[PDB]
Subunit: 126 residues, 3 copies
Amino acid sequence: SHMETVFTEKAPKPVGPYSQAIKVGNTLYVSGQIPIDPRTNEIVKGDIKVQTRQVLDNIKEIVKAAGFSLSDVAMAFVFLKDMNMFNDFNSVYAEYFKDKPPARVTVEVSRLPKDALIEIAVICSK
Amino acid sequence: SHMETVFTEKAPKPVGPYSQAIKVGNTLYVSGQIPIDPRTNEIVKGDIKVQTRQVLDNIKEIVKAAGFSLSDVAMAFVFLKDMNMFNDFNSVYAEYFKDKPPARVTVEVSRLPKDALIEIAVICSK
Amino acid sequence: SHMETVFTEKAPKPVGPYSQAIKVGNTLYVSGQIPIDPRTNEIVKGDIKVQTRQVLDNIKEIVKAAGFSLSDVAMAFVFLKDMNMFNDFNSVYAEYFKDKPPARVTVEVSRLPKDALIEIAVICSK
């Protein structure tokens, strides 16, 4: 009832039974985003840094569409194909969460959708 | 204090230090469910589709026991043993979340409890 | 705005763009903790049981610093390097959550930060 679907054309269009995000009042639940360019609907060319920047940009557009801001991210779930890429991922991530950074979970998985190097999901509270 | 344990005999009986779900007012936190038949306490026979249907049925019974409905699922965490099974998993999942589908996180893990093909945990808000 | 960063010297000091936890009113989001001894900033010597006890102690100190208690843990995300260690992990975990235990998600990942055997993140509500 107070649950709302969030959609923006500025982040990858959901194909299937999920929403980019679900807003319930001052809480936002954001889907695990992968490095899809919304212009092509395919993974962006580049290394972990380019992919991380694409993911966080996807998340930023979703969060902003919902009336939230990156500052409202309380908890981030970070899934890496390769934990050795952590330092490089982290240097880009640090750009987006400079102050009052969210709680974070970081693990290495064996594979991601579209063979992504990284997927990030967040929960926000404003 | 306003935290409540949720239990139903219609979903796998917890063996150990966890609850099927925890309800706090209009928010429900649901344990990662695996394809256990509550009748046998063992994994159901069948492929990813049969296992996915068992998991979602387990989640549905927990959610309903708690006074919630699948419509209240805001965020789903989906862990697959094999990302190549995604399309098949998704065809069953799509049956349970037809309208206003939840935010979703989907990754491939190296192994699950009882060597399950899939485990799903959800957060709901009503 | 009502979002607050949580920090205690009694749990591993964040190095980088994350907070040990984020408190928003009666909800706490806690980072995935690994078996770092805050005295050394390195992984503790020992098997899964010693590592699990270090992780849960880290989580306990964060939760207490925030004005919460382990009793307020609603949902735990448990990531194991090796699912065969589950029974041993569980025997220690059972010590910390004796009554009204949280909802739990448990999966095996291919690797963790610092090659940890286990990482745990929690969400609490008081």
